Amino acid sequence: KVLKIAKEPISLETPIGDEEDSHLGDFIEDKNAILPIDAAIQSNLRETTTRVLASLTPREERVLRMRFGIGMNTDHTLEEVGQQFSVTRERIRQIEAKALRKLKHPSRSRKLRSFLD
């Protein structure tokens, strides 16, 4: 581990060809910039989830969304989402398991079978 310790970071403005044009900084990729395709699957995963949740129970869909968070980013735990609906107990976990096993059929989970990859 001593060797291979980034001995000398090469300058990002170094030339790449026979001339001083198109330096290395213009050829480095981006491992953090969200590509537009990956954002497309994000928006559609927001649309494809709102459609699958529209078939569930209204209160059940609300508690399932609160379990993860579609509009609200505050991902609540089982008990936290439990207090918002009824007595915080295994009933919330039971309804969550029932909903999860609900949209696993070829009818509801049809457009999502090719979504998880």
Residues within the interface to another protein (CB under 8 A): 4-15, 18-19, 21-37, 39-41, 43-44, 48, 73-75, 110-112, 114-115, 117
- Positions in 40-99 near DNA (CB under 7 A): 77-79, 89-91, 93-94, 97
Q: Which residues of 60-81 are buried (b: 16+ CB within 10 A; e: fewer)?
A: bbebbbbbeeeeeeeebeeeeb
Residues 18, 21, 25, 26: is their CA dihedral positive or negative?
negative
Residues that bind DNA (CB under 7 A): 7-8, 10-11, 14-18, 21, 24, 27-28, 77-79, 89-91, 93-94, 97
